[PDB]
Design a protein around this ligand. Structure first.
Ligand SMILES: *[C@@H]1O[C@H](CO)[C@@H](O[C@@H]2O[C@H](CO)[C@@H](O[C@@H]3O[C@H](CO)[C@@H](O)[C@H](O)[C@@H]3O)[C@H](O)[C@H]2NC(C)=O)[C@H](O)[C@H]1NC(C)=O
Ligand SMILES: *[C@@H]1O[C@H](CO)[C@@H](O[C@@H]2O[C@H](CO)[C@@H](O)[C@H](O)[C@H]2NC(C)=O)[C@H](O)[C@H]1NC(C)=O
Ligand SMILES: *[C@@H]1O[C@H](CO)[C@@H](O[C@@H]2O[C@H](CO)[C@@H](O)[C@H](O)[C@H]2NC(C)=O)[C@H](O)[C@H]1NC(C)=O
Ligand SMILES: *[C@@H]1O[C@H](CO)[C@@H](O[C@@H]2O[C@H](CO)[C@@H](O)[C@H](O)[C@H]2NC(C)=O)[C@H](O)[C@H]1NC(C)=O
Ligand code: NAG
Ligand code: NAG
Ligand code: NAG
Lengths: 777, 573
């Protein structure tokens, strides 16, 4: 930050200057920030310019001023170079150009002879000029301007005049006027008159002939306006149309005018265009292609860098543009080639084994036939003396007797500080114990009591030397003298795992437990394992509450403030298997239903048997049902359930059992209904009597849903007179039916009757009831 | 470049022999500092006034006393080093005086003993410091009594033991006490005690141990330990030692009535047993030895610089026996739990630091055998924002329709407020452009209208800074054709296709990776080839397929700024 190279702020810009302008001087700017302040030099035409006092060119704070300019000694390209002790940089190339407009030739123009009824071409022949001009035509005398109608075409490219069909009105003298529009005023140049002579008039129409043909290839940059001209001769005047061969034209550009204008060409407009001139006599066609190119841009540049001497570096620079650009490298204002270590490859720079002479300003230059761009950076190499303030050696290095120690010495130095280890005043060297790796790490094995003391690391390099000290003392290692034993239990009266340790008599010793690398909690949330506390050298832990979910890889660890030791053990908890799943009802019959289920978790003990329970929705309790086979084995997954009463809904569940006990019941099965069946219970509550004269009423108790056993439930009542041998059967549909009335005028009052009843459904017939004696009205 | 005082020379304990006629005592103290530090001295708790004049002087930190006396100068001294940053405390140094008094002038009573028994002759040494060495003289100098099995001398009380007196022991006895100081070897006589005896009967008795070593003998590590087992008996009893709970280490086992250990280690703890045995019988005595040590360090704090608004944890651990206690000092004054500082048995916790928590801190570990110190310096820092280390990207590229991240994290303490601005319009969180409260900016579904300049402003109560980047949009590479899976045998040829589209400006590079491993097409005799090589065609062909050529083939189509991939599978039997 104290010193930095020249960084540009303002760079020179191109200037267009009128040759006969009233201005007296031209200013080109160049400014750079530097510390110390930079010095500026200027290059013209690739060579250095003699900045002499008084002689035209003057230097004002970096800027270059040229007074009373002329095209013979000033027009050209200039560069500004900024320099200081760190390095030099070069600004972008700046063009200064002059504009002018000459006068028309004094030689008389020959008269043009043509046939009446034929298109005629009249040249203009503009003089030397820059930039482009605007062209007009006049007839006979100024200011009579020929209108730009459908019969006369005036070209803005060549300035010529085209007449589609000549008649007697076109005879006269023509003149071409140039009105080059300067940015401040307009200068006009008037051409010598040319006489147009016309021969005898013919009488014939003709097909169009296109004369002003736009070039096949037109190159344009992104953001320019592109004009295409298409003029043709023809009687009558042909119509002009523009088409895109490889696409669709914009509606705003689809015009019948003989000129096609694109205000801002983008990457889309690239392709082939076709102009067609059509009349009743025929058509003529022109084809030409428009391409689009751009100017280089940046994608990845370089930045300031500080590197340590003896390292390697890689720099990159990426530019994008159409056509693809080329990238070259400059240092301090001169091109870079493959030197001893510098490797330049078409865009990337490789440094190997940096030195103190490879510092300065580096520039990356991208170039193509439409422009150039520059990018700057600064490389600074550094060399330092060894400093231990960042990684000092351990000031205290406690070590356990019988183990090993490793002490690394790594200072901050360049190129690389070499180190040597010593113990007190005795220099340590390779032996069958002490080891010194090339990195400087000191490794001591088989550590004993006589190795305590003060060790020193000495580092040095061709800058200077540094030095540091540590002290080593020897303790006794913490050891385990008893390890816990693996075990297994179901729900017993709890188990005490043991862990005994011996430590140095000077430092505190703490025991800690863990389960499968998850932290343990010997406190008391609900069921809890607990920990005793009598003396330091004991760590027994008792697993209480006689419950589940307390198995894994138990680990006891005895640790001090310095080192630690550990041992491992395993416990298992056995028990009844888990509940089954996947209860599926199949083969739904009147009394038999097949049940299928998936095997549940065995809990590390094979399942011995199964038990099936059933219930009636919605408030029926779970009841064990008769199963085929009577004893279901653990490996079986299907069974039969018997004893079911037909045509009610049922739900089922499964329980598993092993030699260790009985597991949990499974979830309820899906609601299913058994098939229909014939009735099995005869109706009861037979009674009756009274009614209208000649009528007999028989009443019975309505039957519930448990014994209907199917749909279409109803009753059949067989009744007869006392002493008669013929039974009359009546059908009463409906389960809730409870009475029947039989009407007959021949029935005497208080006539005894013998009756019986039976129940039926859609499946079959059930048993009949006992015969009862009733009386009529 | 400033720091707090760091001690190089600390005061040391001094014992002054009275005999030597020196006129000045020096207690050293030196503390490196920048700027140089001043010194104060504390004498037995209270501060010391070092006014020029009397015998208390100052020689540049070092304290000098002219002509010290026991009545005005014995005691404890501490050195306090102070500079603008903070002050530090030096380890205590004890100044003590050594002297010896003479024996009392009163005559000693004669000792009457009956021949055939052993007799005890007292010495009664006067006041003394340090310990002495004792001898006995018979009648007249230099008749030194030889150290045989019958004439017995104790090195801790000076008493004289006679196992069995006879007629040859009649006479006068005196006790001579000698001191071995650093510069003097003064020795003192005594009076003459007359020993008169009685009749004789030569009977035999069982040994009786009289001089008993104490039941518990506390001994630090590194202190020579002597055990005395003195006995009576007729004839002379024999002395044998044994360890109750192990071996006696017979490298130095002896039959003398004294047992010596030059340097006590932790393995010598336990109970010893002495036995005096003769043909008549035996006597047995027991006693235990316990070892102890001084505090030592295991983890020590180090000087630290912390940024305002942070938190700090500091630890300090000591090892000794009995277990040491740890306390904390700041600027030479005790530090209790208050405000943002928490102290817990050697754990120091700073929460949300400020500019007033900069200074010298110290950790003290002590027990009934010693005290040790450790020091460190804490410096708090506050900084202005700077973007030199982490400037915003300067040439940010963007792919069309993508999402762009722009982080902005300067180097400041405390954290600085961050604002964003495109051109001269300050952005707000919305559905397309959003800022997050760590400073990062997010933009979604980028378009050509977003090209331009972006700027990040950072500011805190010490200053402000800004950094600008340039955002431009391009055309993203998109895959139009993908390869397909196939199966072949060994030696078969297969062809897979891949097509992409990109911006007309940059270059496409097409590659193929077999199971994420790039395929080398330039290998001599290689089995892979590029076919239908065009700008947007990256078809590859495998010739003479092998078993290793079966796997997943991934087509990579990449430019300098973006890439796009497709996948297919090939099996070789
Ligand atoms: C003290 O003994 C140790 C052990 O033999 C020495 O360390 C050994 O150092 C050599 C190099 O002197 C290492 O061999 C070479 O290492 C380079 C590292 O890039 C490697 O490229 C070579 O292929 C070769 O392996 C060797 O690995 C290393 N071994 C160990 C165990 O450290 C040490 O150098 C000796 N002390 C001195 C002062 O030489
Ligand atoms: C260990 O490192 C020091 C630090 O460079 C070496 O230099 C001494 O530094 C102290 C501290 O300022 C000075 O008081 C001494 O005068 C320095 N010595 C010399 C010779 O300049 C020191 O020499 C190193 N130790 C050894 C044994 O070389
Ligand atoms: C508007 O700005 C606010 C803060 O400047 C953003 O709020 C953050 O939202 C995220 C996600 O909900 C939280 O994790 C942060 O804690 C919020 N910051 C604060 C300071 O509250 C918010 O995301 C922005 N709006 C949108 C649409 O993103
Ligand atoms: C963004 O930061 C720059 C500095 O990095 C500011 O530029 C400074 O502007 C002030 C006055 O506007 C000048 O006095 C300083 O000399 C400028 N510094 C440099 C290094 O040139 C800039 O003003 C900041 N932007 C805003 C909006 O404040
Ligand atoms: C530099 O070159 C241009 C074009 O080649 C030329 O017009 C100009 O005269 C040259 N410069 C000088 C000083 O002649
Ligand atoms: C080195 O280790 C071996 C076995 O571990 C041991 O016998 C030997 O005594 C050790 N060396 C020293 C110096 O203690
Ligand atoms: C403490 O120092 C004072 C200063 O002379 C002295 O008088 C006093 O005896 C000392 N106390 C102890 C216990 O040493």
């Amino acid at each position: 930050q104290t010193t930095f190279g020249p960084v540009f702020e303002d760079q020179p810009l191109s200037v267009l200057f009128p040759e006969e302008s009233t201005e007296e001087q031209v200013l080109l700017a160049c400014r750079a920030r530097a510390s110390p302040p930079a010095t500026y030099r200027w290059k013209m035409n690739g060579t250095e310019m003699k900045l002499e006092p008084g002689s035209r060119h003057q230097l004002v704070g970096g800027n270059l001023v040229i007074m009373n300019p002329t095209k013979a000694q000033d027009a050209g390209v200039y560069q500004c170079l900024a320099s200081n002790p760190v390095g030099t940089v070069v600004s972008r190339e700046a063009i200064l150009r002059f504009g002018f407009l000459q006068e028309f030739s004094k030689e008389e123009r020959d008269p043009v002879k043509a046939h009446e009824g034929w298109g005629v071409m009249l040249p203009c022949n503009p003089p030397a000029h820059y930039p482009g001009l605007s062209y007009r035509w006049l007839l006979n005398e100024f200011p009579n301007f020929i209108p730009t109608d459908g019969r006369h075409f005036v070209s803005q490219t060549t300035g010529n005049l085209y007449i589609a069909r000549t008649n007697a009105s076109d005879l006269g003298n023509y003149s071409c006027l140039a009105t080059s529009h300067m940015d401040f005023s307009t200068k006009s140049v008037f051409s010598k008159f040319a006489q147009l002579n016309l021969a005898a008039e013919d009488t014939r129409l003709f097909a169009p002939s296109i004369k002003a043909r736009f070039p096949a290839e037109t190159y344009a940059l992104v953001g320019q306006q592109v004009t295409l001209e298409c003029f043709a001769f023809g009687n009558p005047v042909p119509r002009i149309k523009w088409r895109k061969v490889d696409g669709s034209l914009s509606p705003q550009w689809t015009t019948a005018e003989p000129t096609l204008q694109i205000p801002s060409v983008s990457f889309e407009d690239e392709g082939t265009y076709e102009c067609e001139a059509e009349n009743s006599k025929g058509r003529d066609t022109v084809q030409g292609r428009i391409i689009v190119q751009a100017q280089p841009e940046w994608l990845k540049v370089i930045s300031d860098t500080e590197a340590d001497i003896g390292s390697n570096l890689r720099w990159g620079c990426a530019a994008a543009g159409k056509p693809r650009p080329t990238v070259r490298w400059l240092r301090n204002g001169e091109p870079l080639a493959s030197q001893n270590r510098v490797e330049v490859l078409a865009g990337d720079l490789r440094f190997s084994k940096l030195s103190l002479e490879d510092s300065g300003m580096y520039q990356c230059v991208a170039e193509n036939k439409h422009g150039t761009i520059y990018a700057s950076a600064e490389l600074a190499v550094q060399a330092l003396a060894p400093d231990f303030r960042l990684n000092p050696v351990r000031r205290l290095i406690p070590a356990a007797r019988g183990g090993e120690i490793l002490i690394p010495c790594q200072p901050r130095a360049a190129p690389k500080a070499v180190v040597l280890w010593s113990k007190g005043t005795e220099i340590l060297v390779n032996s069958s114990r002490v080891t010194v790796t090339p990195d400087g790490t000191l490794i001591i094995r088989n550590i004993s009591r006589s190795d305590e003391g003060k060790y020193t690391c000495f580092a040095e390099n061709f800058m200077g030397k540094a030095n540091s000290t540590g002290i080593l003392s020897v303790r006794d290692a913490t050891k385990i003298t008893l390890a816990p034993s693996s075990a297994d239990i179901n729900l017993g009266d709890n188990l005490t795992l043991q862990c005994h340790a011996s430590h140095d008599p000077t430092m505190d010793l703490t025991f800690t437990w863990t389960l499968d690398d998850f932290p343990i909690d010997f406190d008391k949330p609900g069921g809890h394992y607990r920990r005793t506390n009598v003396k330091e050298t004991i760590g027994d832990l008792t697993i209480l509450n006689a419950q589940l979910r307390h198995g894994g890889k138990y680990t006891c660890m005895a640790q001090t403030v310095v080192d630690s030791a550990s041992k491992e053990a395993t416990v298992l908890v056995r028990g009844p298997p888990g509940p089954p799943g996947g209860v599926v009802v199949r083969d739904i019959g009147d009394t038999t239903i097949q049940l299928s289920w998936s095997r549940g978790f065995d809990n590390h003990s094979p399942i011995a048997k199964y038990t099936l329970q059933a219930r009636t929705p919605p408030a029926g309790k779970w009841k064990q049902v008769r199963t085929n086979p009577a004893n279901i084995e653990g490996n079986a997954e299907t069974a039969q359930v018997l004893g079911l009463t037909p045509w009610m809904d049922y739900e089922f569940r499964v329980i598993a059992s092993n030699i260790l006990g009985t597991g949990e019941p499974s979830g309820p099965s899906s609601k299913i209904r058994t098939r229909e069946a014939a009735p099995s219970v005869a109706p009861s509550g037979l009674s009756g009597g009274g009614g209208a004269p000649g009528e007999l009423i028989v009443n019975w108790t309505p039957m519930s849903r448990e014994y209907q056993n199917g749909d279409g439930f109803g009753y059949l009542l067989s009744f007869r007179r006392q002493g008669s041998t013929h039974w009359q059967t009546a059908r009463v549909p409906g389960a809730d039916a409870q009475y029947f009335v039989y009407s007959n005028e021949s029935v005497r009052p208080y006539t005894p009757f013998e009756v019986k009843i039976r129940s039926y459904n859609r499946r079959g017939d059930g048993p009949e009831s006992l015969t009862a004696l009733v009386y009529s009205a």
